[PDB]
Design an enzyme around this catalytic site. Structure first.
Site, mmCIF file in Angstrom:
data_model
loop_
_atom_site.group_PDB
_atom_site.id
_atom_site.type_symbol
_atom_site.label_atom_id
_atom_site.label_comp_id
_atom_site.label_asym_id
_atom_site.label_seq_id
_atom_site.Cartn_x
_atom_site.Cartn_y
_atom_site.Cartn_z
ATOM 1 N N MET B 12 -10.858 2.569 5.071
ATOM 2 C CA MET B 12 -10.481 2.477 3.638
ATOM 3 C C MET B 12 -11.641 1.832 2.837
ATOM 4 N N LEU B 28 -7.118 3.482 -4.820
ATOM 5 C CA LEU B 28 -6.015 3.258 -3.892
ATOM 6 C C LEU B 28 -4.683 3.661 -4.529
ATOM 7 N N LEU B 34 -1.298 8.287 0.271
ATOM 8 C CA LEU B 34 -0.911 6.925 0.562
ATOM 9 C C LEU B 34 0.470 6.664 -0.052
ATOM 10 N N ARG B 100 -12.552 5.347 2.033
ATOM 11 C CA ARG B 100 -11.558 6.067 1.225
ATOM 12 C C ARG B 100 -11.632 5.658 -0.281
ATOM 13 N N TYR B 101 -11.830 4.373 -0.543
ATOM 14 C CA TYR B 101 -11.638 3.856 -1.901
ATOM 15 C C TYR B 101 -12.852 3.224 -2.597
ATOM 16 N N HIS B 199 -1.155 -4.844 10.049
ATOM 17 C CA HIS B 199 -0.621 -4.569 8.714
ATOM 18 C C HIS B 199 0.709 -3.871 8.796
ATOM 19 N N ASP B 276 -13.776 -7.877 10.487
ATOM 20 C CA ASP B 276 -13.215 -8.773 9.462
ATOM 21 C C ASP B 276 -13.061 -8.034 8.162
ATOM 22 N N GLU B 279 -7.881 -9.435 4.796
ATOM 23 C CA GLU B 279 -6.641 -9.960 5.351
ATOM 24 C C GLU B 279 -6.833 -10.906 6.537
ATOM 25 N N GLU B 283 -6.104 -13.955 4.076
ATOM 26 C CA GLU B 283 -4.701 -14.135 4.424
ATOM 27 C C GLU B 283 -4.513 -14.937 5.712
ATOM 28 N N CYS B 339 4.802 14.338 11.036
ATOM 29 C CA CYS B 339 5.996 13.487 11.046
ATOM 30 C C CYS B 339 7.217 14.385 10.887
ATOM 31 N N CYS B 342 7.932 14.477 7.235
ATOM 32 C CA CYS B 342 6.790 14.638 6.328
ATOM 33 C C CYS B 342 7.187 15.521 5.139
ATOM 34 N N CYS B 347 -0.627 17.627 4.769
ATOM 35 C CA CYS B 347 -0.744 17.214 6.196
ATOM 36 C C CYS B 347 -0.862 18.410 7.143
HETATM 37 C C1 FDE Z 1 2.179 2.133 1.475
HETATM 38 C C2 FDE Z 1 1.067 1.455 2.230
HETATM 39 C C3 FDE Z 1 0.935 1.687 3.614
HETATM 40 C C4 FDE Z 1 -0.174 0.905 3.952
HETATM 41 C C5 FDE Z 1 -0.693 0.820 5.336
HETATM 42 C C6 FDE Z 1 -1.844 0.024 5.806
HETATM 43 C C7 FDE Z 1 -2.330 -0.061 7.171
HETATM 44 C C8 FDE Z 1 -1.842 0.572 8.448
HETATM 45 C C9 FDE Z 1 -3.448 -0.903 7.160
HETATM 46 C C10 FDE Z 1 -3.523 -1.250 5.802
HETATM 47 C C11 FDE Z 1 -4.362 -2.073 5.113
HETATM 48 C C12 FDE Z 1 -4.735 -2.688 3.979
HETATM 49 N N1 FDE Z 1 -3.961 -2.341 2.924
HETATM 50 FE FE1 FDE Z 1 -2.325 -1.065 2.935
HETATM 51 N N2 FDE Z 1 -0.702 0.222 2.945
HETATM 52 C C13 FDE Z 1 0.079 0.568 1.901
HETATM 53 C C14 FDE Z 1 -0.256 -0.007 0.772
HETATM 54 C C15 FDE Z 1 -1.039 -0.842 0.101
HETATM 55 C C16 FDE Z 1 -1.035 -1.233 -1.234
HETATM 56 C C17 FDE Z 1 -0.119 -0.813 -2.361
HETATM 57 C C18 FDE Z 1 -2.208 -2.143 -1.272
HETATM 58 C C19 FDE Z 1 -2.754 -2.936 -2.440
HETATM 59 C C20 FDE Z 1 -2.081 -4.299 -2.252
HETATM 60 C C21 FDE Z 1 -2.265 -5.161 -3.469
HETATM 61 O O1 FDE Z 1 -2.157 -6.398 -3.331
HETATM 62 O O2 FDE Z 1 -2.519 -4.596 -4.557
HETATM 63 C C22 FDE Z 1 -2.687 -2.157 0.041
HETATM 64 C C23 FDE Z 1 -3.843 -2.945 0.516
HETATM 65 C C24 FDE Z 1 -4.436 -3.026 1.867
HETATM 66 C C25 FDE Z 1 -5.587 -3.878 2.182
HETATM 67 C C26 FDE Z 1 -6.328 -4.784 1.219
HETATM 68 C C27 FDE Z 1 -7.437 -4.090 0.479
HETATM 69 C C28 FDE Z 1 -8.250 -5.173 -0.205
HETATM 70 O O3 FDE Z 1 -7.671 -6.062 -0.937
HETATM 71 O O4 FDE Z 1 -9.483 -5.137 0.041
HETATM 72 C C29 FDE Z 1 -5.817 -3.659 3.638
HETATM 73 C C30 FDE Z 1 -6.888 -4.283 4.480
HETATM 74 N N3 FDE Z 1 -2.003 -1.377 0.879
HETATM 75 N N4 FDE Z 1 -2.595 -0.733 5.005
HETATM 76 C C1 LIG Z 2 -17.438 -12.450 3.473
HETATM 77 C C2 LIG Z 2 -18.704 -12.236 4.320
HETATM 78 C C3 LIG Z 2 -18.787 -13.276 5.432
HETATM 79 C C4 LIG Z 2 -17.742 -13.093 6.512
HETATM 80 C C5 LIG Z 2 -17.864 -14.215 7.516
HETATM 81 O O1 LIG Z 2 -17.868 -15.404 7.103
HETATM 82 O O2 LIG Z 2 -17.969 -13.894 8.727
HETATM 83 C C6 LIG Z 2 -20.071 -12.351 3.581
HETATM 84 C C7 LIG Z 2 -21.263 -12.023 4.510
HETATM 85 C C8 LIG Z 2 -22.426 -11.520 3.633
HETATM 86 C C9 LIG Z 2 -21.867 -11.681 2.203
HETATM 87 C C10 LIG Z 2 -22.520 -10.900 1.040
HETATM 88 C C11 LIG Z 2 -24.062 -11.045 0.964
HETATM 89 O O3 LIG Z 2 -24.452 -12.418 1.079
HETATM 90 C C12 LIG Z 2 -24.706 -10.480 -0.319
HETATM 91 C C13 LIG Z 2 -23.964 -10.817 -1.629
HETATM 92 C C14 LIG Z 2 -24.336 -12.241 -2.094
HETATM 93 C C15 LIG Z 2 -23.603 -12.698 -3.360
HETATM 94 O O4 LIG Z 2 -23.960 -14.066 -3.615
HETATM 95 C C16 LIG Z 2 -22.079 -12.505 -3.247
HETATM 96 C C17 LIG Z 2 -21.744 -11.050 -2.842
HETATM 97 C C18 LIG Z 2 -22.434 -10.576 -1.541
HETATM 98 C C19 LIG Z 2 -22.241 -9.054 -1.452
HETATM 99 C C20 LIG Z 2 -21.834 -11.296 -0.289
HETATM 100 C C21 LIG Z 2 -20.281 -11.313 -0.220
HETATM 101 C C22 LIG Z 2 -19.694 -12.043 1.012
HETATM 102 O O5 LIG Z 2 -19.935 -13.462 0.908
HETATM 103 C C23 LIG Z 2 -20.331 -11.530 2.309
HETATM 104 C C24 LIG Z 2 -19.884 -10.076 2.539
HETATM 105 S S1 FES Z 3 3.419 12.060 6.299
HETATM 106 FE FE1 FES Z 3 2.987 12.019 8.492
HETATM 107 S S2 FES Z 3 2.261 14.074 8.870
HETATM 108 FE FE2 FES Z 3 2.638 14.105 6.658
#
Ligand code: FDE
Ligand SMILES: C[C@H](CCC(=O)O)[C@H]1CC[C@H]2[C@@H]3[C@H](O)C[C@@H]4C[C@H](O)CC[C@]4(C)[C@H]3C[C@H](O)[C@]12C
Ligand code: FES
Ligand code: FDE
Ligand SMILES: C[C@H](CCC(=O)O)[C@H]1CC[C@H]2[C@@H]3[C@H](O)C[C@@H]4C[C@H](O)CC[C@]4(C)[C@H]3C[C@H](O)[C@]12C
Ligand SMILES: C[C@H](CCC(=O)O)[C@H]1CC[C@H]2[C@@H]3[C@H](O)C[C@@H]4C[C@H](O)CC[C@]4(C)[C@H]3C[C@H](O)[C@]12C
Ligand SMILES: C[C@H](CCC(=O)O)[C@H]1CC[C@H]2[C@@H]3[C@H](O)C[C@@H]4C[C@H](O)CC[C@]4(C)[C@H]3C[C@H](O)[C@]12C
Ligand code: FES
EC number: 4.98.1.1
Lengths: 359, 359
Positions: B12, B28, B34, B100-101, B199, B276, B279, B283, B339, B342, B347
């Site tokens: 996603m 999304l 979805l 996806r998004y 999830h 990672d 969530e 979360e 499904c 469905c 699908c």
């Molecule tokens: C109906 C439905 C179903 C589902 C499923 C699922 C599975 C198996 C896995 C999953 C996941 C997810 N999601 Fe999911 N899902 C859904 C939904 C949703 C919504 C509405 C959202 C948005 C939330 C808020 O807060 O806004 C999501 C959401 C979601 C997320 C978050 C994104 C961000 O914030 O970045 C994730 C990681 N989801 N998922």
């Molecule tokens: C959340 C994640 C760390 C996960 C972890 O602690 O394992 C970190 C690792 C590298 C980071 C990114 C990179 O450092 C590059 C960017 C730096 C900016 O200051 C914020 C967005 C920015 C795009 C970052 C967002 C976030 O803090 C990231 C994605």
């Molecule tokens: S919703 Fe599961 S096959 Fe279409």
């Protein structure tokens, strides 16, 4: 030679004759490990009396009673014969039937085991997948028996409380599916869709942490692995009662839906019980396969044979007991964790009853 | 040398920076694979706008963006390096990210694969367990892409559409669990309860026949088997949104419930994503482990490391692609069964798109 090791085979049971229906339902609606009601001692006999005609009529439609006791006896006999040879040091083994809601009742069985002067008693659930509503209730009955009688056991207790993936159980299911696939027209065999069908649970039970849906899913995956994914499948859930939310999709809705979507060749597989009973013989064989399926335009619907008298099945039973004895386990690791949202004070006492056993 | 085989890694995705949150949520809520909403093209922008601030704040709390692309790239690079050696007849391999998004979008990836003049394209879902809401939506995007451009593909397609029990995936989870159990105080290790957290799905999706809960359960059982049932566990379901019924028990309620019942040493295991993402980092790591756990009196709560850059995981990816190529499979047997209930006409078209491929 007097018996040394008793194997208590636990199952809900079913009424053996139409006359047994009322008391079966009465005990079922009185069971606080299954459900709680207001003024339950008053309302249980009322629901029982009300629902007896409908349930009697279902049993009438399958020949006049449940074959559960016959199949359990046959399996127990075969198990014991094997156990005497597998485990001479714990022989003679004897099986006892402990049905939750009909005679012989769990409590009658314990009484007889205690009178028989056994060294060891094994609470061997006949549900491969653990639910608090099934195996949990039967194990709670054992704890409550001793608690209400006001005496400690005179025998060493332990439990085989689940076995969803036992290799020989899986082989039995796969064998019965393969043989039923052989009964479809050859030209439709690859098109067959497998519906594994297990009794549903109310969402209130699922949502408190019941282990059953996950274990049932595990049995399904092991069976399909053994079958090399030869046909596609879904795990669906049968016999919800009443208007409240239960775990779906429902087996009946799924059959109808498949038919409407052009999947007209369906194999039903009872995956969570090991003998025929009202829900295979009436619900799947009559209600779904004869009535609904025909209304929906099915081409071929078949049901895999229940494990019943398969000698490989009594071999699975004896293998389980033998491994349990050899391992010295008192219960599975899983039994040591109660549902995250368990609100029944007895489940913890029952767990402790087993984990604390001498040996 | 110009690439021969493209591996489209489907996920996603997540907003890389705070400014990406709005368009992520817009895409999304626009996704008809979805969810189905009345006047969806009109309502999705209003829903996205309303929810942007809350989601932005979650991302700020974890450092300001999602690490999904970083981990996906690393995993893709390692996969390709291995595949060039495992499968010289399909080399050079190239990975493409199809989120996806967010960018790069599934559609942008397909466009780039076609420009690159590949002989073969493999839609490789990065969800090990199939839901129509996740993998099904990504595969539907591929069918819809060609349907919308009004052109046939210029490369052969196939899909690895699920892999819930791949042996090296299981080994990675078990390895990460064992590593995290080593970080509990030694005297609490046997008392630790494992909470597998996946999830949740709405009950409307579960009840139409979604394959996901049964496949998740299968992954859980294989991990626990590999771990020899060393600790007790439950499978519980995280982050339900809105007021309608979703599949429970919820992860948050289960944590609270366990604590209240004296189970104060908990290991959280994200079982249904391979890196990672918000969530786990917000979360699980903040809301449940920092705030909820403290409020409930937890002694020790830890979370197993996501698979992330584990080299054994890159190896699992390459072995899956290698087996898929050697088998000549176009998709799993499971994909050939929609499904039972469905109601999405796309699908069946997507399923046929894959099963009907030349070769
Ligand atoms: C109906 C439905 C179903 C589902 C499923 C699922 C599975 C198996 C896995 C999953 C996941 C997810 N999601 Fe999911 N899902 C859904 C939904 C949703 C919504 C509405 C959202 C948005 C939330 C808020 O807060 O806004 C999501 C959401 C979601 C997320 C978050 C994104 C961000 O914030 O970045 C994730 C990681 N989801 N998922
Ligand atoms: C959340 C994640 C760390 C996960 C972890 O602690 O394992 C970190 C690792 C590298 C980071 C990114 C990179 O450092 C590059 C960017 C730096 C900016 O200051 C914020 C967005 C920015 C795009 C970052 C967002 C976030 O803090 C990231 C994605
Ligand atoms: S919703 Fe599961 S096959 Fe279409
Ligand atoms: C709550 C709950 C839960 C549960 C669970 C279960 C499982 C897992 C399995 C089962 C089963 C069963 N069931 Fe069961 N369950 C329940 C219930 C019930 C009730 C109420 C009843 C009765 C019905 C009527 O109709 O009345 C039953 C019922 C039942 C049955 C039938 C019996 C006779 O009729 O004989 C069976 C077989 N259940 N199950
Ligand atoms: C339902 C089951 C048949 C299973 C099957 O053919 O698939 C049969 C096998 C043996 C049967 C029982 C035995 O024949 C003995 C009893 C005979 C009486 O005429 C009716 C009740 C009675 C207690 C039977 C009820 C029911 O028809 C049973 C339990
Ligand atoms: C179907 C039956 C109605 C009896 C009748 O009027 O004929 C009712 C009576 C008591 C009901 C049960 C009790 O209310 C306790 C359970 C509560 C759960 O929310 C649904 C399942 C649950 C197990 C109920 C299923 C079903 O709706 C029962 C069994
Ligand atoms: C959470 C959000 C409410 C927007 C808001 O007022 O903040 C609403 C808007 C549309 C809702 C969704 C749609 O009604 C479609 C789905 C309906 C299912 O019964 C529950 C999940 C389901 C996916 C809904 C979950 C949630 O209640 C959503 C996502
Ligand atoms: S209800 Fe499951 S342990 Fe009490």
């Amino acid at each position: 030679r007097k018996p040394k090791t008793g194997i208590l085979m636990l199952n809900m049971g079913g009424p053996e004759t139409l006359g047994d229906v009322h008391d079966f339902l009465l005990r079922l609606f009185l069971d606080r490990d299954l459900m709680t009601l207001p003024i339950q001692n008053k309302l249980a006999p009322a629901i029982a009396k009300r629902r007896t005609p409908k349930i009697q009529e279902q049993y009438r439609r399958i020949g006049g009673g449940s074959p559960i006791k016959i199949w359990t006896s046959k399996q127990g006999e075969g198990m014991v014969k094997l156990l005497d040879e597998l485990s001479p040091n714990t022989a003679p083994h004897k099986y006892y039937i402990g049905f939750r809601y009909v005679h012989p009742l769990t409590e009658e069985a314990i009484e007889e085991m205690e009178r028989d002067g056994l060294e060891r008693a094994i609470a061997f659930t006949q549900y491969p997948q653990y639910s608090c509503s099934t195996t949990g209730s039967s194990l709670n009955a054992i704890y409550r028996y001793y608690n209400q009688v006001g005496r400690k056991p005179t025998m060493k207790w332990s439990t085989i409380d689940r076995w969803p993936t036992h290799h020989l159980l899986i082989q039995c299911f796969a064998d019965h599916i393969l043989k039923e696939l052989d009964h479809f027209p050859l030209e439709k065999r690859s098109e067959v869709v497998i519906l594994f069908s297990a009794h549903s649970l109310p969402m209130s039970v699922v949502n408190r942490g019941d282990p059953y849906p996950q274990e049932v899913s595990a049995t399904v995956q092991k069976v399909m692995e053994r079958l090399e994914y030869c046909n596609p499948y879904r795990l669906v859930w049968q016999s919800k009662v009443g208007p409240m939310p239960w775990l779906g999709p429902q087996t009946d809705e799924s059959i109808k839906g498949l038919c409407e979507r052009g999947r007209k060749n369906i194999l039903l597989v009872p995956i969570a019980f090991t003998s025929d009973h009202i829900e295979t013989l009436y619900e799947l064989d009559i209600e779904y396969s004869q009535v609904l399926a025909k209304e929906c335009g099915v081409e071929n619907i078949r049901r895999a044979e229940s494990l019943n008298g398969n000698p490989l099945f009594s071999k699975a039973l004896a293998d389980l007991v033998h491994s349990h004895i050899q391992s010295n386990e008192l219960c599975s690791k899983q039994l040591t964790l109660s549902c995250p949202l368990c609100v029944n004070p007895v489940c913890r006492e029952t767990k402790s009853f087993f984990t604390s056993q001498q040996l």
